[model samples]
Target: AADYVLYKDATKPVEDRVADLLGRMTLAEKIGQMTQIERLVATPDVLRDNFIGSLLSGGGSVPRKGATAKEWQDMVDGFQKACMSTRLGIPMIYGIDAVHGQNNVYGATIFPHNVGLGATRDPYLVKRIGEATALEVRATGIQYAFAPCIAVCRDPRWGRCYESYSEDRRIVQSMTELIPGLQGDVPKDFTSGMPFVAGKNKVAACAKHFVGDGGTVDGINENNTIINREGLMNIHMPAYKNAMDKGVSTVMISYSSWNGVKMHANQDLVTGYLKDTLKFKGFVISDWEGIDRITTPAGSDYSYSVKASILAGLDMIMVPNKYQQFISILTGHVNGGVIPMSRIDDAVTRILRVKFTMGLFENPYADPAMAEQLGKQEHRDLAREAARKSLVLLKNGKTSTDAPLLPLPKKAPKILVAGSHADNLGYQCGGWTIEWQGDTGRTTVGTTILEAVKAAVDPSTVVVFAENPDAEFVKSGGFSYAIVAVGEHPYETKGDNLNLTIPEPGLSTVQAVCGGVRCATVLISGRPVVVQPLLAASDALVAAWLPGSEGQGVTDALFGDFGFTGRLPRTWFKSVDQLPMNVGDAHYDPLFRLGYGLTTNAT
Candidate 1:
């Protein structure tokens, strides 16, 4: 056989191989490396003809309807094979928002969201979750994860508060352990702030929304952040520093703005600060259709927005569905010198460097054997443990003498479970589960809170479940005690921002259940909702912040299998008037202060 091309030789240094490949690439191929398309629009011909460098499953995007783990692997491997058919045979990196435990794939263990994990105050546990997530993601042939959002959320009103680790910069900084767990441990001699993907089982981890995404005014999604540089650095910039130190492979830019400057076009920050000053060596990727929103009405000036974002040091453009348009425009700009060749080279070089570091060339195909790890029993157990540690007991009792309604006796004669979320797995998992904006009902596999309650009690105990038990029924049941699980419906960024009220029938349910019989309220939500009235009526309150796919975790805390260990990650405000409350605020007066959690004596 003839000698392999210099770029094709596996033994050569990654830099040398990248140089050889860059030297032989045409303008079209280089532009393609900068383009990232959604899988729905990606065909073999589309990938080959365009020389596309990467693909992603935006939010809910999946393979054929109700795809299995093997099917996911097959789909990604097919894409990888198609990329190999190109002239250079370069492998394309597949990316997904596996933010919380390969959440897009059904049957995969759904660990607690960042908010719940943050409440646990355990970095090692978070890291292990990341490792498990990486394994599940790799099982589906994905090599990149858009995770560890690392946004130091200042206000709980933000729709993505669940994505952030904490409101404190120090806590957010500590959680960067997720980076090493996903990408593999950092090398001892690793001093450079460059991208690093350690090996195959580990996938690339992204520290995202660049800076100040969690500090948007009024907690608006993709809105403006008016803070000065000092405040920005103090609250938001520290986490990225920690992520870079952990050798995170990528940093994703936010759609939100800083002082009216769209992050996608903020050259001074993205290039001058993050790249040049802070020395972040990883590729900087744009968020979904992020560049298009640079203008007032979005995509108003696509051509100009592309030029601005490219010049601003975006290493990869998540153009999603508009790859052809993005490619044509970017190609014209480079040829016209509107976007210099130097910029194009920089972008492609960064993309190729990550691909090389990820070992994509040598092992581009998925190992079907890994499919077994998709939702293995061990992973589900860990998720259950995570949920156990994540439950925070807010109001343990109505008074000191009546305190500690938890550790419910295993031999209770009768237990009444009421409320909409008690038997719903979908509601507990929250957003970014099987679908985006997450649906209600039994959308995926998992024990419901009601089921967990039943399993915890003795076989002889009578456990009655009701979506909504009226006061009359509750009073007539002659139950030993009632457990009410109620809270917000499943929602992502769109419908999540609240005036802090516990939505509708939830308040009514709490009133009815507690009014008739002593009941503990398990609030399954993404953040702290207004519940002063409900808290007053309930015997106990537990902040069950989206404990994903593991209802047994709730029972672990409730029935003495595990004591409540999670503290409030965010301050629980009393009402909407206390909007934007935090631990260090000047006039801080929260219903439940940060770090307030009661523990039960586990038997």
Candidate 2:
């Protein structure tokens, strides 16, 4: 006769279920729960043999070639079934970097990046965006989102600056409402440090890159953050507190260091401060290849790196594709007593606690019906509203009499739209779209800025789009006015660091259009770039910061359908010489001060 297991009972309380489950798990099973593998390498035999607990779709990793919602549901459910085949019958959790929206999916709504949303400064709206994101993520059968990257960027030079909510800690703190919106609202009596999602619509949210990733020296990626304890607590650590308070299910450790110490191995902060002092009941997950980077050369001594990170405080390791090696090393460490049984049990307990709370045991399969919500028009409308609210009017004409060039006439005889970004969806969306570093051209669906302009204008009003129109065409085309959209190319953390200058032909294009006709220059970029020279040449300038999939919002603001209501979330510096300048910095002299924006009257 089969033995009765209290852990297998669904009616029991979560704590009882977790305790019973932990007691029943073998060392191999426990270690398996702590290991997270990438989807491609996850075979049925691999999952069964290793007792795999979780899988993730790295950055651009997806199922099939252009997988539909049902396809993704099938793929993830297949993986979960493989995990169920093991003796323990444990279901594996699926995670994705659904940062902006269910961004990994082909047809998911792509909302404006965090920088653009921060400019809106409406926590309520941000929460709603989180809700939409959750629905879309759940539609794909994914149960975890590595999102709400609440890194309060102090410097604009950081490559990942676009990921931060704001330079002000308060703004980032307030946006933690996204936590409750992703997972359900916090219980009134929720004194427990652990917070879990309440329903099937919601998925577990991870507050990422742990501490001090955004405060690296010179804004270098994966570099040292040499701040004092007070500075660390004051500047970089507050957002995590907010995340914890709202019941973020998981916390990802940062790749950057703290006071010359890599965050991956910083037991004092990871174990002592975050886990103990802060009372963070959620598990601490390592970043992609995070533990491997603890050694000077990265993965120099795999065994020691595993020991350091686990003993330090990491509960779940995102080993990605190297699960076999990771499992072998981690298993050896446990057998040799290099890693204590108590620590192993603690990690497995946290993982099981989250799993039980997520109701994965009872509901392991994806709801194929939920697939209908993918890229729904309502979400796109919300994204459009977000984009409209995110636009910052840096300059609108040179003088009051000549100001408000926006709300441009919709029935002009001819309108010339010029520049690389004018008609490109990928350029406007920036990095982390369909691809990892993101590419140019029509990478995904959505109206381009030029398309929006054409649709907004009267059918009689001819719209001519030229990637690089010369002054000759502008002067001879008998154009009423020109819209010159230009900015940085698609890029993420790597290769984005720059002297902060708008790339080639952009400067010349602005001059050619504005110099030839009364024109507005709309900059589509991730962050503020040096534009003092170009600002002088154009009649008006708009900071359209990475407005994803909703170019209609730009037209909505430009053509008087909507007013320019967005204020600057980060200060706009005059030049690269003022690289590290922020709003609160002493002797700050920004081109556009923080919270600066202008409104336009409807036509």
Candidate 3:
């Protein structure tokens, strides 16, 4: 063991270790370190043969159906052991889309989405959520988390709006507090821009879809952003700056385009700007198949795609699949003097720097006991606390001076709960959930709105539940009041809605229920949806923007166990045509302006 090389030794400076490792590594091994693949293709043999540096589970990529956190550790550790067996004895880092609290795991506590977190404007609270998320992510034995999506989603029409913290750059900048939370704060006299992960309990954080991913035309997925450099630096570029300040370990290039060039191939930004201008110390990673999409039709010209993205300053490639072809083409390119050898060294240096700082070299295996912490009550309580603060009371009365319908009595004689979203946990959690685009009914673990209501109310109080009730039932049911919960289907980019209308049965439910009975309608949506037409029907309205796994918090706010404190993180548009509206824009006529929220006291 004393004969071991400097790179293999624990007591050595990171830069010296990286240099020693780089010197010993062959071109093939270096290339392997730059390649990232999905766990599906990441078999032990495959990983050892290909020399892969990283692996990821993109929504539902688990060892088995509803696998436990221990099972996940077993699976990931297998990959870790395989990579270490290679000649260099290097370890492969496993990553997950733990965007909302290790979402792929069945029993993990799900936190409110970024849209909801943005409403609170509580940096300390958001940081705590990050800490909890990091703990849960590591519980599954994962090292890196593709999270804290820091996109300043300028329009709700974009399906990924829920991933963004806010439309305002200031709020989005503040939300970057999650970076230090995910990767713990740096040590004394630590390099300010260097990546740092405290220990196994913490994980490397990625500030993703870098630069203007949210400002794309009409909020379309993978479309071009038309903003000028002035507009770009103002709206989208600020968070990356702040993320760097917190020393985010990695930056993921967006799949979309700025002007006409895909960000995956935009050397000017990724290389010239991000590397030279901003001096981002960490490695720049490509999104899932990000490089392939650079061409008109994906993978049409694989050879050039690899060349372009690699030369564009993309240090790591999330090839996901087709690793053989990508490596083959990349090898050919580097051999032919197309991609400079120095570029490869530069990429590997940054990667090794991060690997050294994260202590991945010393401890690559996961602790199974950490699994016990997954979805624990402490985290759930925090999530519940988060959900309570995230609920934005949009309307509390039919008139400005009218008695508010909120703070409803828990011991009421009779109450009715109805809507598509009322009982669906999947709908309440939104996208990047268990599955990529979330599903309904026990998607993972969490309380439903009906269950929460039932738990809140006294046993003597009669409760009526319906997905959608008829007008006659509401008029004759003799209910004291009705609570209707409805919203859009959980989705990612597919959530892009030009119309932004409330889906079918929800409109009918609100109409039949709110029109007849004094009702408080709760919209469990990722972003603001059309509610003006239904505004008059409901006596009160609460914008419960995807409360995740804690529906108890919803009832806490509704029953006055907690006060309503969330302010709007986005402008509630009157119509789709009036969009591109914010607080500062001229002629800003909105259904509700940014920062608008009605308040109620805790009884």
lDDT of every model, 2 decimals:
0.88, 0.87, 0.89
> What TM-score would you give candidate 3 relative to the actual structure?
0.98
Q: Model 3: per-residue lDDT, tens digit, 1-603?
A: 668799988899988999999999899999999999999987888999988889989887888888998998999899999999999988888888888788988899999999999999899998999899999998999989997898889888999999988999899999998888888987777654577788777899999888898998888977889989999999999888888778899999999899998899989999898888778878889998889899989989888899999999999999998899989999999899999899999999989888888999998999888999899899999999999899999889899788888999999799999999999999999887888887878888889999999999988899999898999999999999999999888885689889899789887889899877999999988898888866878898899999899999899999999889999999999888988787788999988989999888999
Best by lDDT: 3
Span of 10 residues, lowest total lDDT, candidate 2 = 489-498
TM-score of each: 0.98, 0.98, 0.98
Model 1 reaches what TM-score against the true structure? 0.98
Pairs in steric clash, model 1 = 500-530
Q: How many steric clashes between backbone atoms does each model show?
A: 1, 0, 0
Candidate 3 least-lDDT 10 residues: 186-195
Give lDDT: candidate 1, residue 496.
Answer: 46
Which residue runs does candidate 2 get wrong by more than 4 Å? 1-4
lDDT of 2 by residue, 564-589 (tens): 89998888888767767777788799
